[PDB]
Design a protein around this ligand. Structure first.
Ligand SMILES: [Ca+2]
Ligand SMILES: [Ca+2]
Ligand SMILES: [Ca+2]
Ligand SMILES: [Ca+2]
Ligand SMILES: [Ca+2]
Ligand SMILES: [Ca+2]
Ligand SMILES: [Cl-]
Ligand SMILES: [Cl-]
Lengths: 393, 393
């Protein structure tokens, strides 16, 4: 089978809910990330044969959100585009599907990534069927399509509490994990470890010069001394999950360029990394929290690798309890997982995070002179996706 | 490269806007189609390794629409699922991506299809940012995300008028094409030519037995003597497109099961058809109407076939002018295109039509003892997808 290489990989900084990017539509954040990925390698945009963008909450973004991102990035109108929705796994599934397009022989160069502006998700009304007498409900699209389990009608955070109970993960352990994610995020930013992968967003102003948004803003929104006293927001009695040890709602995008060996060599491009293998797995919807621990072994077996062969891991931190549970189940050394921080501190724009953690993993491997890395992310409905990459030194 | 076979292919009947399926959510229509595809071949649901469903208008469907369809069809909670959005090409792109997953070596059996309930698409309000003084607008999600070109802010029907003008396709020609689509649809239904592919929808009633919806209802909504007198709804002066010669808004779903050679032979299944090749193409957004004439030659070249090798064609009839324009550009014999009727008469649930026309094409080829067929469908943003299949006798 053809090899698939990652020749560029970038992300926007992540904005807080109703924060610095709340006025920049998801499709424009996608445009910034895609253009950034092309610009890193000075790639002629007409070399791109397809664009796959993860995007969970598409309402009100307008027709063909992935086309809007591609055209906004400067790709020509001859570029096909598709938006993909595997909830929080969307950006990773986009990369996997793009790799399959290369392996199937159909494209030599392809963009894959994800985008989300959670600040701009609308509320919904059934406007076509009148209500002759009675109150009418406007559903928050974030809660209805993003954060509520269909089958239980409960918030993802309630599923996080189920995980905490079953795997004996305490409030104190979740808080310590969260504090570590905040500390690692601030340290990696201070060390320049996000400078390579982050492409800034220019924000037009009503009057004056644009604001250049260049750094994640979520990880500064923390008061460490308040963390052990915050209320448990999903469960009144015997709860464990809080606003601080859960991830937040965020805005951001990410993008990667994938190529065949023949195409990258014809262009004189040295790859960042090779995609070794990938896999999806699923279990009961209420157990989406531990599905990454099912998906990663499948990807490892496809790679003919063992868990001991992986130098660094990126597991998306939808909740601190999710990070702790998958580490515990797989027996992972926490010093090798999310070493530059994770979503509890950095943020979590649903449709982008699955590709964002690949972007970060590439740079973690280079920063540590490592070889194999693995990334995995859970998703609503009970799923997870996982991918194994090889750093090319 | 591995061959990819279609071992089953079904569709729901299509309901009219606010019609017989308006109370059956898109995800449940998807469940009916997927279960129907499994039932045709008595397939153990656990053989399915992934599910890709096209779905253009996901707002308010709840979390993970493709999971809801899969679980509703009786697939186990171990089945990964993804929803794909290439506007009207979504269902075809789902099938193409699924074929790539087989060719890439990653799955041996996969479900691909599409689903849409246009009746249930909500209106949108920005509920998070108050408006201190002034009227507030609720955008129709169908118009905003489905039917309006982003760049021109005009309806797809206005792009249809641009096509009519540039390609000299008159009102009278569009009306004659529409009448032919209605006539062919009624004839094929009367001849039993949709009995094989259509799986009925049972509709629960407030009191009493369910209603069994088993036949397309759009093609009976026509008054032939009124057609030449209807108003031109997108352009007041010198218009050509009407409510009768444009497609309608509709509800419906469709689903196919794809397999490798090794898997179908191990299960003792005879394939319906082989997927020979497929392709995407794009041009300027306002020229989405003629993009099928760009995509099909790419697919033919990948198949090492010429247009003369194709026995029958399915080109989605988003508008009569689109059908006429692509026939004219490619020089196709209208007696070989959409021979059982098309979307102008049968309906057009956006995310399902791209796979629906493959389902219909399979049966057209068998009904006519034919070999090669091609299907193609345009999509907002300037794209089209095309697929070439080989009937297995
Ligand atoms: Ca700094
Ligand atoms: Ca937090
Ligand atoms: Ca260990
Ligand atoms: Ca009949
Ligand atoms: Ca019509
Ligand atoms: Ca001809
Ligand atoms: Cl899933
Ligand atoms: Cl496109």
């Amino acid at each position: 089978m053809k090899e698939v290489f990652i020749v560029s990989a970038v992300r926007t900084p992540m904005g807080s809910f109703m924060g610095s990017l709340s006025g920049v539509p998801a499709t424009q954040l996608g445009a910034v990330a895609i253009k950034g990925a092309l610009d890193k390698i000075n790639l002629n945009p007409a070399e791109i044969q397809d664009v796959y963008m993860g995007n969970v909450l598409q309402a009100g973004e307008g027709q063909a959100p992935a086309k809007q991102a591609a055209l906004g990035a400067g790709l020509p109108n001859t570029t096909p585009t598709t938006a993909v929705n595997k909830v929080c796994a969307s950006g990773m599934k986009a990369v996997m599907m793009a790799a399959q397009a290369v392996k199937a022989g159909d494209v030599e160069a392809i963009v894959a990534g994800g985008m989300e502006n959670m600040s701009q998700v609308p509320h919904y009304i059934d406007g076509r069927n009148g209500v002759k007498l009675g109150d009418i409900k406007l559903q928050d699209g974030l809660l209805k399509d993003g954060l509520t389990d269909v089958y239980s009608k409960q918030h993802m955070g309630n599923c996080a509490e189920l995980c905490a109970k079953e795997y004996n993960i305490t409030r104190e352990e979740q808080d310590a994990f969260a504090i570590q994610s905040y500390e690692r995020s601030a340290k990696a930013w201070s060390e320049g470890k996000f400078k390579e992968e982050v492409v800034p967003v220019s924000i037009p102003q009503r009057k004056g010069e644009p604001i250049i948004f260049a750094e994640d803003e979520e990880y500064k929104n923390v008061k460490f001394d308040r963390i052990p006293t915050l209320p448990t927001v999903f469960q009144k009695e015997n709860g464990t999950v809080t606003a601080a040890n859960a991830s937040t709602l965020n805005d951001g995008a990410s993008a990667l360029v994938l190529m065949s060996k023949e195409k990258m060599e014809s262009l004189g491009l040295k790859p960042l990394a090779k995609i070794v293998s990938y896999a999806d797995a699923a279990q009961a919807p209420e157990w989406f929290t531990t599905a990454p621990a099912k998906a990663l072994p499948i990807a490892l077996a496809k790679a003919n690798l063992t868990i001991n062969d992986i130098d660094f891991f990126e597991f998306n931190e939808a909740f601190s309890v999710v990070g702790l549970a998958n580490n515990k189940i797989l027996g992972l050394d926490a010093a090798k997982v999310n070493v530059n921080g994770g979503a509890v501190a950095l943020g979590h724009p649903l449709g982008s995070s699955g590709s964002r953690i690949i972007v970060t993993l590439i740079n973690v491997l280079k920063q540590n002179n490592a070889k194999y890395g693995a990334a995995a992310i859970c998703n609503g409905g009970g799923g997870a996706s996982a991918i194994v990459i090889e750093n090319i030194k």
